[PDB]
Design a protein around this ligand. Sequence first.
Ligand SMILES: *[C@@H]1O[C@H](CO)[C@@H](O[C@@H]2O[C@H](CO)[C@@H](O[C@@H]3O[C@H](CO)[C@@H](O)[C@H](O)[C@@H]3O)[C@H](O)[C@H]2NC(C)=O)[C@H](O)[C@H]1NC(C)=O
Ligand code: NAG
Ligand code: NAG
Ligand code: MG
Lengths: 142, 228, 48, 714
Amino acid sequence: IQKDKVTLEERLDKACEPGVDYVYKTRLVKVQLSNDFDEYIMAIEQTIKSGSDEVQVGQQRTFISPIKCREALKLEEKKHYLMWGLSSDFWGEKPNLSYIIGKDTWVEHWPEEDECQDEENQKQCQDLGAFTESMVVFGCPN
Amino acid sequence: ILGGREAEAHARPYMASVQLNGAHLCGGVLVAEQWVLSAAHCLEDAADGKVQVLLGAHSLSQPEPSKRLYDVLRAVPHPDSQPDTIDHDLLLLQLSEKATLGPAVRPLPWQRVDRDVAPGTLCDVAGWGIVNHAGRRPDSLQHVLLPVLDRATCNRRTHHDGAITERLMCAESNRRDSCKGDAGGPLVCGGVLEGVVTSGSRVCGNRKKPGIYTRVASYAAWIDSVLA
Amino acid sequence: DEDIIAEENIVSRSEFPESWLWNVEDLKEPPKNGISTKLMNIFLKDSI
Amino acid sequence: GSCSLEGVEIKGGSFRLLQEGQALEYVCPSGFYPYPVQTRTCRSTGSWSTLKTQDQKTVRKAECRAIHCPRPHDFENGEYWPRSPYYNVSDEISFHCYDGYTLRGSANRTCQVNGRWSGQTAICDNGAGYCSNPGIPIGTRKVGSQYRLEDSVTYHCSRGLTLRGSQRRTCQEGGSWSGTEPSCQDSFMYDTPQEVAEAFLSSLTETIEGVDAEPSGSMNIYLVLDGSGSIGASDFTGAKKCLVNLIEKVASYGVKPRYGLVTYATYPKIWVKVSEADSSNADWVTKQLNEINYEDHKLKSGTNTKKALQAVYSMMSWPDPPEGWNRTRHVIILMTDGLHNMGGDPITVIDEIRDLLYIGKDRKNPREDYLDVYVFGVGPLVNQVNINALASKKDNEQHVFKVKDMENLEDVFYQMIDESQSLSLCGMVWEHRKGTDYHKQPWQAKISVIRPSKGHESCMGAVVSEYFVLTAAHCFTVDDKEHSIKVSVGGEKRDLEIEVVLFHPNYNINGKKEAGIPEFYDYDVALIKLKNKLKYGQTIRPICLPCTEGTTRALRLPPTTTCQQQKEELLPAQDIKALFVSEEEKKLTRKEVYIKNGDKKGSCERDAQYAPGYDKVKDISEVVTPRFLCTGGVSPYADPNTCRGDSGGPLIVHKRSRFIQVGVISWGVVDVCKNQKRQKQVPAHARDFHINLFQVLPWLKEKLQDEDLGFLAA
Ligand SMILES: *[C@@H]1O[C@H](CO)[C@@H](O[C@@H]2O[C@H](CO)[C@@H](O[C@@H]3O[C@H](CO)[C@@H](O)[C@H](O)[C@@H]3O)[C@H](O)[C@H]2NC(C)=O)[C@H](O)[C@H]1NC(C)=O
Ligand SMILES: *[C@@H]1O[C@H](CO)[C@@H](O)[C@H](O)[C@H]1NC(C)=O
Ligand SMILES: *[C@@H]1O[C@H](CO)[C@@H](O)[C@H](O)[C@H]1NC(C)=O
Ligand SMILES: [Mg+2]
């Protein structure tokens, strides 16, 4: 998608857009470079917004993204990320679905617990924390 | 009563409410001080139940000083009444005692002269039967004036096709008609009871199928008999 | 850029038949010199 | 807070704040429309909703643009004039077909104010395929010229337009394309309340006339109302009131279906379940429809349609094989804006539902008639793409509706309640277990005539009403009295007493003896008025006749359908697939034939010269009047030939699970029938002629006037 402050209300509307299907808080378990399709194996920590893919916490889903964007993703294993994508970014027949990280996929680094005590992450962990409960309890407005 | 009106409170003392198990079933009319005329087919679904008669009532729920629920002392369905046909569909109910006559309770004169009602005559018919096709049960008594269609036309093939005996009379049902729950209702053609509501089942309001009523005048013999 | 027509307000050609005008005409007009004449107003295709 | 009104205005028009300033609606002058969107929502960011187009594009300034009707960017087998980059309102365009091609549909069409073209789609067909040319709806593009069996076609809409209906249609056995006719929609076309109510009922009532076969209570209606915050209390309460009058409208038919009431938001809310003992109580369901409110889903104003359809799923499901499952019609009606943001694609549920009802999971038994899905667009912003993906796609039927003003539907439904109109029952045949003959052809009538030693005449006819039996006119003579004519129907052993036989005024079988023509089967039709009224049962039912209100619904056409339009439907300019009933060893069996009404008509007619007696006929057209339909032969297939005993029988056209009589078996060229078997060596010129009912309508309409068949004026 993009990259100038992306507030809370910003994340709410963007994550409730008609196009957006799934919204997860995942942990990058393994990263692969295999022939045709590049592979990011994420582990869903919590389903903020249950999409059209029946997936529960603890399971793993494989993501695919071109090499040209690998430099921009700079994803590191064992790290957590808040990501949501469109229903038009699925790939393969169920239950062997494969999420595709396209130009319309939101990805954001999720500062871990002990890292949210930093005077640089406290402003972010509060927005994300607030975004979570607001999307779980009440769900998308309208 | 499709396209009817809310009758004025106790403006029809003769109006009765035959109730099965404390619940309205059919319409009735107080023809005597201790007799209620109604439709015979009403006791086809009864059998295991407690039949009663509510006189001097307007609202079936709200309390009214003139309301009183009598008990059926005897039910006399006309001998020639079959569940298969509408012919001879009359029923006489004897109350446990004489009805306490008042401003809201009074017997109604019923025709004896066996002569067809003049076509075009406005007759009043009331009851607590549904008021819409959905099946809404009215709480207050409803009524409506209906022109009397001559048996000649009512017997046309396009209508009831000669299925109207000399003992039955027709009334226009152009979107205004006595529906389900009105069976046994009074058809008063000028202060006098001429017919009793009885048409089994149809689709209330069908102008091409006028309402059928049993002429009490053509059964005076049997009636007088019972009340003795 | 600033000038030219919008790339959206451009109605592109499409009708490029190899053959058309497969119709019939009767000459009932007032015959002069035994030579009847009709004036057909037809629409040319998009093909160049 | 309230979003700023800075830079929200529109060029060449104004606007009006609604919902207490939480949304605005652009107001454009007569002839123009707000672009890109109609209304705009107030996001929780202080700024209004972004101006998104139909192609999901972004626009800076809003502009009021002139209303144009979709320009034809694809048309075959003919030409259309004039061609323009765009068409304004009131603009007219006409269509013409090349030689050898027949034109069906509106020849001239005018661009109306609703941004739609008047009349029906123009189609230039040659009637040379198993199925007719599906045509190319204005604004679309068809990919597929082959119209054989099993063949398919695909439709695509211009850029900025949304496709409504089916994008792919397959030619199915029995001459009929699958899905429904496509239509290119724009972002302001909407639908007039009448149009909606008119089409929604012409599709619902039909799938109810059949439900009468026969608590209770053999049809389910699931009302799924969307209570999301994206609809507003205005377009929500108006949706209930519309449903209320709909329940009454249905009730006026005297039918008591099982209802299921569900309103949904972040979660589904069930008010009425079909399994409840009160589901069939119309008044019950209505009281609920009144108790529900738009404030019911304010705390959690999500739009999870998926779970909503999952609620309906659990209602029609079983704990694991109810006796009455493969006999129940399911009807889902849901009001929504199509803007779902929770649960994902709701379509997945629809598929699961179809799997549960065993639909589309058998080539020979589709079972499509057992599930209908209607989707009504209600919210200010409605996604026509998504509501079209849920709604069913049935030939000649509409399941997608975008209500303009709404609330007016309510007032239209109330106005459309008429207890006088009866519920049709003609051309009904359902797969009953026993399925004894006469269950498969209830309309079939067996006529016999006794004559002094001369022999017995064996003909057949059809039950068209409660008193009449349509048959051939040559089966009887002026000498034959009523006492010597016995009719039997429903397979009953007994014989019915007739009242009178009505011959057609123009029937004169000897009106050609001078020209040397012994037989003259022109206007060879007659009616038999019975002395007793027939009690319609599982073995005795009527068959539909051309040009009747009852038949219009069977074909699922608009009530405003003229007689001429019905003929173009039933008898198009091609090889029409039909059938007739024959007697096979004291057992009724069907025989599929092809009515040569296309270009093969000439090849079929002239073969009448081979018939006995006609061998010396000067002009063959003198014995085959326009009152004749031609069947039998070898092209395009080897059709079975009618027998003497089949004479007078109905020439039926089976379409959309309904039977429509379009002819009466008059005479054949070669007598292949010979009470011993069927002359295994039939000639190529062995043709069979019938009487086109569309030619004797004046006589039918007149004699049947008091039969409540509701013939059309025209
Ligand atoms: C599509 O549009 C054309 C154009 O109207 C239709 O053809 C027209 O048919 C009408 C009826 O015969 C003709 O109307 C004529 O108008 C003149 C005006 O002076 C009048 O003098 C004549 O007495 C007659 O009323 C019209 O001439 C004719 N147009 C032609 C031949 O150019 C056509 O029927 C329409 N297609 C449809 C809707 O089926
Ligand atoms: C149609 O109307 C528009 C707006 O008035 C106008 O600009 C255009 O010229 C018209 N189309 C034609 C016939 O050229
Ligand atoms: C269930 O209904 C279907 C309808 O196609 C019918 O074919 C089938 O025979 C029925 N099942 C049984 C056990 O009869
Ligand atoms: Mg919503």
